[PDB]
Ligand binder design. Structure first.
Ligand SMILES: N[C@@H](Cc1c[nH]c2ccccc12)C(=O)O
Ligand SMILES: N[C@@H](Cc1c[nH]c2ccccc12)C(=O)O
Ligand code: NA
Ligand code: NA
Lengths: 387, 383
């Protein structure tokens, strides 16, 4: 339940029963031969795993530093790493005899992934989404509707991601017997941070095998963007015991760390409790304060407790990249490698480019390209302008 | 050169020189050890081949007849099969010493694939696109520019795909010494129909191996959508010599075959010469306009190798309306969690009707040629 001082089950007593049932089911099914057969089958044939590890040769040469590989989570079904978690939890839900899935979403990407997994497995899907995010993400709302999911606008509180999570928790207490609450990052009360990390760790396991095959050795650095932290945990976790491999999580620097408009919880937040977990949050008064990022998936005031832990024990380092830096990396990757990255993933690219220039040419960097940029074209069109 | 009577190389003297140079280069490089090491490496690490073969279990059980499998070309980098052709030809261009790629596009999808491949190999990319299509494909135009390509609006003639092809050809005769013309389907003069089919046949070879692993046998029917015909040939070509395997191409029925608003060249068109080849074209007489809700299927002509297959009766060709493809778009999204391209939805729509007639022991493979992210704006307006 804890990662050092972070994690826990900071929830009302009505949630402890449901969380214990989930913890017991997961402990049984995680190593069950039939569950993993079906999971791997769906990941292979429906999601398209494994994804490749791609040597960004032009980008490497242009910077003239370390070798930059991209783990291509942009190629999984739906365009983001979120699918790995959505399938895992939706299948777990089916094996527990649940008929309905609920989920929070802010950017809409998790909402879409949950709706896809729900469609696949013949399950009912309701997505809680803050009204401000509904307005901002008209196309993802439409994807969810096409996929057969029902989107429920959340009008309470700040009308955004944190409020959707709380409304989803309120639903789950009343409906847990037939409903699984499908959380979209390594956040929330135990066992969710563990379950989501476990279902994303396939990224790192593939990456480790692919890099040893491609280069005969472990990478020097692994770089991943961090919103809540699931894609980073997925690629990090199989290298945690490899002491030589530096892990770098990249948070949303927004308009700048001193601008007050960012989502860098580990960098500038404080220890706090929200959504069932003890972790780092941006807060003023005790009030969990609004976050910002040009990348909608990084727009969350908190962070997963396992990242707080890895930062505390200094196993991983955490940095911030601004909106402008990510936007330059989005354009740069597109025209240098013909890969349009997600704006979230562009933060990790942006940092990797700075980091490669310093490092030696014999050394190796893996960047987790967590998603594709199709979803972000409207945004980039507005902000970068038509060209 | 030819496929039965169809195909050929009916171009002026200014095109004979570059086309012959391309045939020699293609002969040289198609089986070269170094060329294939680079191609398979790019298809694996950058494009993400192989793509899976998916058993659509809920769709199959719902319909209650044949097992429907989907060849998941929607998962290739870029979201459509065209990437296969774009990499192969762009690589060929690099091996021939070319620094520039030109290409036609109407839907924008070949334009994006060529832009991506050009970015990948460090080549200049100019995309010829009709002004009517430039106006209807804002986001694909943005994608191309984002990928470092330039988009040259074509204002001659009907301001769409056929005219853009013509302008690229006029460019290529002037610039062939350093430019490769990257054609986007199995059309145009020899050797383009052969080259494009060869670069897409990876689809069919994977699908064959995959269905043998899953089911222990070849499929009873393969169903693919047909615009120019590159995704259909890709999946058809490895099964041509397997006599038991039925091949079904699905053209755009549009507003209806009786309506005059469709792109079913094989079904309702006449034989003629255009863009240096003998094939089927919709005719008024002269070549007339085409229409489909799926922009990728919106072309009045069709590949000569499909004309050949239709004649020998090796492959059967059918049409599916806008309405029918739309219903299949929604059905596959809701039932399987896969949002198909509207082009691909034509293939799904026909495979669904066909599955109903067939038995539960029998197998259909549908080429799911692309994903539907690009079509959401169009589907939103109709919805
Ligand atoms: N906001 C993103 C990612 C996300 C989902 N759930 C979260 C919980 C915490 C942090 C981030 C997330 C999305 O909905 O796609
Ligand atoms: N119109 C589609 C497909 C296409 C490209 N070139 C073609 C030539 C003939 C027929 C169709 C095509 C596109 O541009 O993406
Ligand atoms: Na955060
Ligand atoms: Na046609």
């Amino acid at each position: 339940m804890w990662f050092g001082e972070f994690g826990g089950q900071y929830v009302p007593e009505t949630l402890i029963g449901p969380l214990k049932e989930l913890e017991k089911a997961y402990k049984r099914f995680k190593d069950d031969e039939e569950f993993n057969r079906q999971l791997n089958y769906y990941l292979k044939t429906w999601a398209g795993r494994p994804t490749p590890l791609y040597y960004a040769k032009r980008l490497t040469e242009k910077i003239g530093g370390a070798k930059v590989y991209l783990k291509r989570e942009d190629l999984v079904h739906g365009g983001a790493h979120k699918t790995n978690n959505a399938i895992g939890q939706a299948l777990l839900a089916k094996f527990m005899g649940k008929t309905r899935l609920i989920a929070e979403t802010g950017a809409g990407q998790h909402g879409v992934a949950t709706a896809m997994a729900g469609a696949l497995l013949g399950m009912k899907v309701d997505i809680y989404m803050g009204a401000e995010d509904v307005e901002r993400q008209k196309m993802n709302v439409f994807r969810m509707k096409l996929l057969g999911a029902n989107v429920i606008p959340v009008n309470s509180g700040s009308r955004t991601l944190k409020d959707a999570i709380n409304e989803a928790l309120r639903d789950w207490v009343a409906t847990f017997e037939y409903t699984h609450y499908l959380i979209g990052s390594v956040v929330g009360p135990h066992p969710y941070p563990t379950i989501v990390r476990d279902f994303q760790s396939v990224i790192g396991r593939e990456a480790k095998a692919q890099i040893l095959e491609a280069e005969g050795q472990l990478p020097d650095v692994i770089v991943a963007c961090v919103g809540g932290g699931s894609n980073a945990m997925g690629i990090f976790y199989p290298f945690v015991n490899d002491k030589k491999v530096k892990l770098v999580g990249v948070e949303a620097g927004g308009k700048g760390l001193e601008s007050g408009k960012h989502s860098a919880s580990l960098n500038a937040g404080q220890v706090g409790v929200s959504h069932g977990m003890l972790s780092y949050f941006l807060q003023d008064e005790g009030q969990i304060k609004p976050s910002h990022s040009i990348a909608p998936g990084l727009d969350y005031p908190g962070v997963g407790p396992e990242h707080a832990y890895l930062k505390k024990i200094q196993r991983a380092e955490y940095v911030a990249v601004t909106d402008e830096e990510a936007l330059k990396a989005f354009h740069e990757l597109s025209r240098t490698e013909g890969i349009i990255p997600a704006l979230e993933s562009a933060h990790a690219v942006a940092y990797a480019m700075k980091l490669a220039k310093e490092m030696s040419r014999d050394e190796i960097i893996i960047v987790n390209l967590s998603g594709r940029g199709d979803k972000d074209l409207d945004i980039v069109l507005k902000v970068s302008g038509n060209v």
